[PDB]
Amino acid sequence: MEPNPNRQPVELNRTSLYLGLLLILVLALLFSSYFFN
């Protein structure tokens, strides 16, 4: 097979990881109360 020429690499910098995690965690801190209801 021919190596598909439409692919690019993917990236996520350190800050984005942090900004990411902060969002996930706080959302969890916000919705957990309603999940346990």
Longest dimension (CA), the chain: 54
Q: How far is the CB of 36 from ligand LMG (least distance, A)?
A: 9
**3 lies in the site for another protein, by CB under 8 A:** no
Q: How far is the CB of 33 from ligand LMG (least distance, A)?
A: 12
What residue has token string 């996930």? Answer: 24
The tokens describing 25, both together, are 């965690």
Cα of 6 vs its chain's centroid, Å: 24
Residues making contact with ligand LMG (CB under 6 A)? 13, 15, 18-19, 22, 26, 29, 35
Residues making contact with another protein (CB under 8 A)? 1-2, 4, 6-18, 20-22, 24-37
